[PDB]
Amino acid sequence: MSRLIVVSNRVGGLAIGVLDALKETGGVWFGWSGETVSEPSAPVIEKQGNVTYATVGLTKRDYDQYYRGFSNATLWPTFHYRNDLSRYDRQEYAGYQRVNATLAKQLKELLKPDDIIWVHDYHLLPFARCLRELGVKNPIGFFLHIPFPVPEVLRTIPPHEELVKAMCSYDVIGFQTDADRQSFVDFIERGQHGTSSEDGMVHAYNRFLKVGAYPIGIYPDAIAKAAEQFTDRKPVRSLRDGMRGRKLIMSVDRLDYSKGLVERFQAFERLLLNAPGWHGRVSLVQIAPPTRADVQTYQRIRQTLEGEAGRINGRFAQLDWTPIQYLNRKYERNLLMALFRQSQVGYVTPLRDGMNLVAKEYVASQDPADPGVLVLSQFAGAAEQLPGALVVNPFDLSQMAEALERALSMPLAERQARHADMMAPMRENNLSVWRDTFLADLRNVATA
Amino acid sequence: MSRLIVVSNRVGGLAIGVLDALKETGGVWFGWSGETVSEPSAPVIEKQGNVTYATVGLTKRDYDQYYRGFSNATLWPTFHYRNDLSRYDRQEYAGYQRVNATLAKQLKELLKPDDIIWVHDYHLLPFARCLRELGVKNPIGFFLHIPFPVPEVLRTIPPHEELVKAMCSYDVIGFQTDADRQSFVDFIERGQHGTSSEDGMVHAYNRFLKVGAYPIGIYPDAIAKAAEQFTDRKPVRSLRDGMRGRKLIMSVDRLDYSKGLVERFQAFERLLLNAPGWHGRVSLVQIAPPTRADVQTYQRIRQTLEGEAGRINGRFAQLDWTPIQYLNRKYERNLLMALFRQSQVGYVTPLRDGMNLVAKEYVASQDPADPGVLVLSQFAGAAEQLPGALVVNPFDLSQMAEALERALSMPLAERQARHADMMAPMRENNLSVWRDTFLADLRNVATA
Ligand code: NA
Ligand code: NA
Ligand code: NA
Ligand code: NA
Incomplete structure (x- = not known):
């Protein structure tokens, strides 16, 4: 069966959500190691049982612009309806895009044609578009753990249009609640970027994708x-x-x-x-x-x-x-x-x-x-x-x-x-249901 | 022809918008005089040409709760998408309702059966419902001069549901822009309070009303x-x-x-x-x-x-x-x-x-x-x-x-x-067009 490739920022919380599926599929958990390094290196591979961990460091500049800057000083406050606390800086947004592209380039070396890829949270909004630009055709799903703000609030983020476009490179997009899903679809429809279809499908930016609410549970x-x-x-x-x-x-x-x-x-x-x-x-x-x-x-x-x-x-x-x-x-x-x-x-x-x-x-x-x-x-x-x-x-x-x-x-x-x-x-609706329902939609993408 | 009755808070800005219609219809401009008084009095009548001005004072408590409190410390910041600056107090909201009811009771004494009533801005959201409770059947229109926030933001105001319900006692509701109109209609539809009909009509809370955008102009x-x-x-x-x-x-x-x-x-x-x-x-x-x-x-x-x-x-x-x-x-x-x-x-x-x-x-x-x-x-x-x-x-x-x-x-x-x-x-789309388009809709309400 397909390896599950999990992509997130620090590589329990997410662990309890994904590790069972990684173990069942002999998958890979990829992302930033949480450490800052002087010079970038190839991803460090560490096998733990049936799971492969592949992590990389970031330079201080990459960390300041991508993580401290655009992710946490722009997206986080605005998505929590406090754009008065948000600050936008073009150089930080450029680093945010640069880090997403760098990680996608390094992940691509580890991919097999059968893999399915599950990307997590607001640091990685453009990651699927970076992968598509590298010719990656695998199923890619995204899950947003924080709210997705309604259009009147989202549009205060200056590059918001480029971000939503990039998000539609994902085959499946999951949100925590129906209101978050409707917020995303409202932006697309009211901006004349796309339309809603049947069974949660959306046609936008010359692509079809499934958009749903998958509220995260516990055991x-x-x-x-x-x-x-x-x-x-x-x-x-x-x-x-x-x-x-x-x-x-x-x-x-x-x-x-x-x-x-x-x-x-x-x-x-x-x-x-x-x-x-x-x-x-x-x-x-x-x-x-x-x-x-x-x-x-x-x-x-x-x-x-x-x-x-x-x-x-x-x-x-x-x-x-x-x-x-x-x-x-x-x-x-x-x-x-x-x-x-x-x-x-x-x-x-x-x-x-x-x-x-x-x-x-x-x-x-x-x-x-x-x-x-x-x-x-x-x-x-x-x-x-x-x-x-x-x-x-x-x-x-x-x-x-x-x-x-x-x-x-x-x-x-x-x-x-x-x-x-x-x-x-x-x-x-326990945590296994959350993971299995999302993954069933992701495995339903490539079915010809 | 029907007298136009204009209702606002301080009784140019609004003046240039309404005074021509007051003069044409021999109407009445009613509201708070801007002064605080120890004991309330009957409205002071002052005729100026063809226009009648009818103003009342407010006690310090009424002014603190209705104007400084709920209007300016709750509605104003939230409707401008800064609910982090908003503060809610039950006693202030009670005074806001009390002042609206008191003014409506005093206005009712001055009304003739043929009058049409045009109420202005966020201080007076429940004014039409107060009038209906007094048995007032005249056409009543409302115009909101500030934004109307989308439901995710509006619902942070604790009595927001009672306020929207009261707003539907108006026969005509005007907003500055289409986004404000859609925000209002979104609340009603998504809360299952009512439905959209033809030609800008809305059916909500057992009433029909016209809801539109009338962007205010200049000369x-x-x-x-x-x-x-x-x-x-x-x-x-x-x-x-x-x-x-x-x-x-x-x-x-x-x-x-x-x-x-x-x-x-x-x-x-x-x-x-x-x-x-x-x-x-x-x-x-x-x-x-x-x-x-x-x-x-x-x-x-x-x-x-x-x-x-x-x-x-x-x-x-x-x-x-x-x-x-x-x-x-x-x-x-x-x-x-x-x-x-x-x-x-x-x-x-x-x-x-x-x-x-x-x-x-x-x-x-x-x-x-x-x-x-x-x-x-x-x-x-x-x-x-x-x-x-x-x-x-x-x-x-x-x-x-x-x-x-x-x-x-x-x-x-x-x-x-x-x-x-x-x-x-x-x-x-000059200021006369704004006034005439709103007033034509208001005069189209009672047409049997
Ligand atoms: Na919600
Ligand atoms: Na106990
Ligand atoms: Na607007
Ligand atoms: Na000059």
């Missing part, structure tokens, strides 16, 4: 088992002993403006103002791992958040109670699931998220004999897939505060029914 | 005449004498984040870096009248802009040349047209504008024997109506700098052809 019963197996670890026992007599609201996210952590803190403050009986009886733990602390944008968001924790704690703290426990550190994944299992409320209200997996993991971590309650943003991508979550508009601090209060006081029978209602579709 | 030949008649005024002679031997780039806008004045300054800086031969041979005049300086949002934008002028001047100034002349003051309208006529480049590149009239006024002010060149944002609403403008993406500083350079060096014959190409549609 909910594996998470449940891991959360239980890691409950008897020292950090979990520490959390439990420190929280005795109090309910725990747990919030975990990278320190990004798209996560709305200031709003999360402020709605918790509003809860304490609305319901003074909760003082000393609830705490908010915010875990915010060290993110892209090199960016001046992220340093500012972090300083803002840190001051809000200080302000709210100063306002409500007692000599034996810190309302917001803010921790700037990373926990091992299985341990984190055990921490979710200890938490009566999972507080997952990003302003914009392609598909927040923390919401699914929080729910699947719960003890079904005594499950906690998920409070979820309507902009997290995951709400339609989690019937039973308390869904809120994070721009409405009062609604969020009232959902925290509802979550904290919810009776067991209703908490169990909500948890069951969310577990069932997560089991039905 | 271009009146502007041309005023600009010429005010050329021999002292401020114009001062400008001319101070600019001798240099080309003038003129930029005029309220000091708002939607105007992109920092980007305007930075692209001018990029021009000076790209083309050092222009040093001492061109100046940028930025007129930025005192705006909503009470808002802390606007104080920050102003401080940012002021520092950018200081930085760029410090970098490039010579002992007899200030690159950016920034003036925080207002000029009388006819005098301003004369200043446009003195300017070789009109620099109108807002990040988001419902319909920038400065672009149309700048062009119509020009001497056709020696006309200046318009550089225009693709997000200003006015670009489709000004064929011949140099249209730019304001998020692309290099493109804007290169358009300034192209404008500054453009030969007379091409400058004249561009000016002619823009004057012709401005004459054809």
Whole structure:
């Protein structure tokens, strides 16, 4: 059978999504190694079982222009509906194109005629067009892990037209949600670049391609088992002993403006103002791992958040109670699931998220004999897939505060029914379904 | 014939748009007087010729919640695609609804059964629903002067669903551009609230209504005449004498984040870096009248802009040349047209504008024997109506700098052809056409 060739930027997260298919097909995982090198070298080949890893370094200039620059300082903020934070630079965009072309040229040397190629995320929008320019005829699929912004927002990116054209060199394009798919198709149709056809097909820029929504899932019963197996670890026992007599609201996210952590803190403050009986009886733990602390944008968001924790704690703290426990550190994944299992409320209200997996993991971590309650943003991508979550508009601090209060006081029978209602579709649309449904479409391209 | 009843917030700009129709129909202009009062009073009636003015004051609380609060701190930033600057407060939204209801109750006392009612802009979205609740059956039309944001952005406003429902109590809804109309209809259709019908008709919330684009125009030949008649005024002679031997780039806008004045300054800086031969041979005049300086949002934008002028001047100034002349003051309208006529480049590149009239006024002010060149944002609403403008993406500083350079060096014959190409549609779709086309649709509602 065809080797699966996976292409991504740093070569678990994506790993748990693709590695089984790589192993089944004896495939190749190709991309940047994450290291900067003085001079480029040929890809380093490392076989691990049935899987071949092929990675390359990038010069500092390539890294600054392609990764720090166009990918993370232009595409990332705009695709998260914050083009006010975006900056465009022609030289960075040129390097973004140059790196895509260089990687495609090096991947081509490793390709066999039967391979199918699956490319991941916004760093690699033009990668299929680079491959077609090299004469590569293999099936190529793309999956975008973050939102795809509607045309009024997309068009603020100066080379947006060239990017969408290049994306249609892919045979299959997958997005997280139907709204992302419709956003992409809207651009094409309303710009008179192409038309919609049957069965998700699109005719644009002299090519046909399939465009679909494939929301990424989890393995909910594996998470449940891991959360239980890691409950008897020292950090979990520490959390439990420190929280005795109090309910725990747990919030975990990278320190990004798209996560709305200031709003999360402020709605918790509003809860304490609305319901003074909760003082000393609830705490908010915010875990915010060290993110892209090199960016001046992220340093500012972090300083803002840190001051809000200080302000709210100063306002409500007692000599034996810190309302917001803010921790700037990373926990091992299985341990984190055990921490979710200890938490009566999972507080997952990003302003914009392609598909927040923390919401699914929080729910699947719960003890079904005594499950906690998920409070979820309507902009997290995951709400339609989690019937039973308390869904809120994070721009409405009062609604969020009232959902925290509802979550904290919810009776067991209703908490169990909500948890069951969310577990069932997560089991039905689990991570294997995501991978297999995308790959079946990719294997349906070349069928004559 | 039916009296025209105009409803707006401060009771020229709108005046030049409506006053002729008020005079022809012996109509009424109703709304808030702009003053805050301790206790509300009945509307003050003042007849001026054939027109009746009926105005009321608002308490400080009503003004803070309805005008400063929900209108200007929630709707205005979000409709200009800056929901990151928006803040939502339930009490402010309640006052917004309360003021709309109070004004509608007072207007109803002045209505005759034959009147047609024309309501203006985002302060008054629910006004027609308030009137219907009072049993008012008259034709009611609405015109929105600012953009209507696409659903992904609109839905960040927490009560957005109630607002769109209320808007469909209007018989006619007008927007500045087709994209605004499609944004509104997209919300209704994709939320399964209603359907599109023939001839711009919409069926939603158990009502039919007409929804259209009516881009607001100017009187271009009146502007041309005023600009010429005010050329021999002292401020114009001062400008001319101070600019001798240099080309003038003129930029005029309220000091708002939607105007992109920092980007305007930075692209001018990029021009000076790209083309050092222009040093001492061109100046940028930025007129930025005192705006909503009470808002802390606007104080920050102003401080940012002021520092950018200081930085760029410090970098490039010579002992007899200030690159950016920034003036925080207002000029009388006819005098301003004369200043446009003195300017070789009109620099109108807002990040988001419902319909920038400065672009149309700048062009119509020009001497056709020696006309200046318009550089225009693709997000200003006015670009489709000004064929011949140099249209730019304001998020692309290099493109804007290169358009300034192209404008500054453009030969007379091409400058004249561009000016002619823009004057012709401005004459054809002038302000009278705007008013008459909207009013004909409003008078077509009750026709049995
Ligand atoms: Na428990
Ligand atoms: Na969505
Ligand atoms: Na002249
Ligand atoms: Na537009």
